[model samples]
Target: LEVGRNSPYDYRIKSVVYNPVNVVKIDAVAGVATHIVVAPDETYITHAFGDSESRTFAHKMNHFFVKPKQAMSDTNLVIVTDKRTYNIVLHFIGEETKKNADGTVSKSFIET
Candidate 1:
């Protein structure tokens, strides 16, 4: 089984081979906004929660509004473009990770 590789530019923007192993992992904090940058012909999402928001439109890219419930942990999302299809695994972190040990603030976003 072949896995999907993360490549912003194709070997010429050809159609990608589909495989379940092609998993992308994203670490997101609650209430933080994350996005995946893919010009997709169509987008599909699976196993979404009621409290979270994952919105997409007919445009060049898509946004992942990850305002997950406190108990949420793991979830998967899918984006299928004409050229390729990819999968993502989103993980949620608590507010403790929102600030660094030194008190610096942190946030999460994705572009792929």
Candidate 2:
């Protein structure tokens, strides 16, 4: 999806998916997202979370039009445009995973 200001560009996503468990509940609110510019050519959708980890949770759940070499971090803020239509699928990752032994390996549950 190429979003621009008054560029006459419009499109819709057929489907989306997210991971974990609890985060899925926030999908309704998270789906309405905007792209954030990490650099000139690198961008990722920002999730509405203040912390770096919460933001990362949001990024993991959404699909990216342009995939970054590395995933978006939790601290980045997502950008949204009022004129844009975003079809999003929100996935929630369980809280327990954060407490896992490794803190790296956790189960993810995806919901449409």
Candidate 3:
């Protein structure tokens, strides 16, 4: 599932799971992501860097990070660990759009 909103600026999110994970969506303008395992036996830690609107295996310290390139909209991220048990859609609003918020200002992606 998606975490944050499509902002005009930048942001980050971290999620955890047991294993055999599902799909997660991160909509950043562009950033770094890390994913790791917390199982018995051996543990795995992996990280990936993304270009403009690019995606990798996304990961971290038992935590996960996603970079959707701030101001990204209408993006669908599918994540599967070990394999796909199910699928989920997601979205993010970066603080780049300079969109209006509660009072008045466009310092965000969406019409915040």
The most accurate candidate by lDDT is 1
- Residue 81, candidate 3: C-alpha displacement in angstroms: 3.4
Please tell me which model should have the higher lDDT, number 1 or number 3. 1
- Overall lDDT per candidate, in order of appearance: 0.30, 0.25, 0.29
Candidate 3 lDDT at 106 equals 12
User: Residue 17 of model 1: what lDDT?
Assistant: 39
Task: Tell me the spans in candidate 3 whose CA falls farther than 4 Å from its real position.
Answer: 1-30, 33-82, 98-112
lDDT score, candidate 3, position 111: 11
Q: Which ten residues in a row have the lowest lDDT in candidate 2?
A: 1-10
lDDT (10s digit) by residue, model 3, range 75-95: 333222232122233333334
Candidate 1: misplaced stretches above 4 Å?
Answer: 1-21, 30-45, 49-51, 61-112
Residue-level lDDT of model 1, residues 1-112, one tens digit each, is: 1122223222224434333223222223322232322322223222232125553334433332323343343322222222333333444334455433222222222223
* Residue pairs with backbone atoms closer than 3 Å in model 1 (clashes): 4-22
Give the top-scoring candidate (TM-score): 1
lDDT of 2 at 74: 24
Q: What is the Å distance of residue 13 in model 2 from its true position? A: 29
